[PDB]
């Protein structure tokens, strides 16, 4: 038995949003609901306990309430830092038996779009001595969190041996991603130049390296 939350909600900057937490009379109806905020990378943060009490350092923008078997977390004056996964919780039948909600991911709309910063690293001399060459394309500080990566060598698109990560949230609510071109030492020295082309919101940022001068 787990508590029912919406999988995702969204609000605009400066506005307010509500997250519901529906259970039975055994858990939520018991009258002692807690709320927790999970931001990727950081440790989980206790927001609310005892339905309405705020934990230490929790601003009044976070307000908990409950009507019977349904608890609600209300977040006012939404900011980009509020984007996180929110979980409700309650004891059931015992103070040592806690049940968690399904979890709600909060998206704050209206944030300014940000182009990606791109850094393209050549393979190192040590890796080249092992007859391998990895080109590392690091993409950071873009919003919204979706980019398309295209690799090119001497004007031709590279599809084989390309691996690109998902976009992952940064601390500033911006996103990061990386793309790896795994070549051999000979493939690296064969071409005249390699390019990592990152497209974001119709705009493309391109960084290039040339094996003749990366030595």
């Amino acid at each position: 038995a787990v508590l029912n939350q919406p999988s995702s909600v969204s609000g605009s900057l400066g506005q307010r949003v509500s997250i519901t937490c529906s259970g039975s009379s055994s858990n939520v109806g018991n009258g002692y609901v807690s709320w927790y905020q999970l931001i990727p990378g950081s440790a989980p943060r206790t927001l609310i306990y005892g339905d309405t009490s705020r934990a230490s350092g929790v601003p009044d923008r976070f307000s908990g309430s409950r009507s019977g078997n349904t608890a609600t977390l209300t977040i006012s004056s939404l900011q980009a830092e509020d984007e996180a996964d929110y979980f409700c919780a309650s004891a059931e039948d015992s103070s040592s038996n806690a049940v968690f909600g399904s979890g709600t991911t909060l998206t704050v709309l209206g944030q300014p779009k940000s182009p990606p910063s791109v850094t393209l690293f050549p393979p190192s001399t040590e890796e080249l001595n092992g007859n391998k060459a990895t080109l590392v394309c690091l993409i950071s500080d873009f919003y919204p969190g979706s980019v398309t990566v295209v690799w090119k060598a001497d004007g031709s698109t590279i599809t084989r041996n390309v691996e690109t990560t998902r976009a992952s949230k940064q601390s500033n609510s911006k996103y990061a991603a990386s793309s790896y071109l795994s070549l051999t030492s000979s493939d690296w020295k064969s071409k005249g130049s390699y390019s990592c082309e990152v497209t974001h919101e119709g705009s493309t940022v391109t960084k290039t390296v040339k094996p003749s001068e990366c030595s």
Partner: protein
């Protein structure tokens, strides 16, 4: 600050054992709990041990859980027996508030004596009596089970799997010959399994301008991550892969 320590990889059907210590205060005065989150799942309660030595567990997992504690060394342990791939999760050590409140009350329209008339003598001491405005009623008892997590540890990622461990190869990253005012360096942590890997710079003395990226997963099952630093001097990245007991301090020179 709560610190979880234990193995990053454990084989199926083995016993996963973790320990928790606090930095800054004593765990002797607090009730210590364990919470985990499997990837792509919600938070899941495991159990706790309170100041009185009593242990309570998630009923669904009670037969596989054991939470003990040592009060001389100020340490709390967690044991999960016969682990399976479902037990892969990030495990958090917590301090929890646990309390059961009992409330005694007469039912609606009943009192402990006032305005009961003849019913006060007829109902007796043990029961409530009907108020003007059945003849008797017994006391009702409402229980409020208070639970919440006071403090959270940072969490320890534990992967359960029968696959082998591959140590990473750490390579220095730097721009090519041919400039920019702020030099950008990096470190490539190539072809390792399983997660996680930690990266610091100059033994933790360098934090401004550091950007460590999440890992990529190749089809071979091996992971690779990179960490870059922007500096407007010696630079060394400290890579640690606990699953293979590997620790590499790679010097990076432009």
């Amino acid at each position: 600050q709560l610190r979880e320590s234990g193995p990053s990889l454990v084989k199926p059907s083995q016993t996963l054992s973790l320990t928790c210590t606090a930095s800054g205060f004593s765990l002797s005065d607090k009730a210590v709990g364990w919470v985990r989150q499997a990837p792509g799942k919600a938070l899941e309660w495991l159990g706790s041990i309170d100041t009185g030595g009593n242990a309570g567990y998630n009923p669904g997992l009670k037969s596989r859980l054991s939470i003990t504690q040592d009060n001389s060394k100020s340490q709390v342990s967690l044991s999960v027996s016969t682990v399976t791939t479902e037990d892969s999760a990030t495990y958090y050590c917590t301090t929890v508030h646990q309390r059961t409140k009992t409330t005694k009350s007469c039912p609606d329209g009943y009192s402990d004596g006032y305005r009961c008339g003849w019913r006060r003598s007829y109902c007796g001491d043990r029961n409530c009596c009907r108020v003007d405005g059945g003849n008797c009623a017994s006391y009702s008892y409402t229980y409020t089970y208070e639970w919440y997590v006071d403090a959270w540890g940072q969490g320890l990622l534990v992967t359960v799997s029968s696959a082998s461990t591959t140590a990473p190869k750490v390579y220095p990253l730097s721009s090519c010959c041919g400039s920019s005012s702020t030099v950008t360096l990096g470190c490539l942590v190539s072809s390792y399994m399983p997660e996680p890997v930690t990266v610091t710079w100059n033994s933790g003395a360098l934090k401004s301008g550091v950007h460590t990226f999440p890992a990529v997963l190749q089809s071979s099952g091996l992971y690779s991550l990179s960490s870059m630093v922007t500096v407007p001097q010696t630079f060394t990245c400290n890579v640690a892969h606990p699953a293979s007991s590997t620790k590499v301090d790679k010097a990076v020179e432009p």
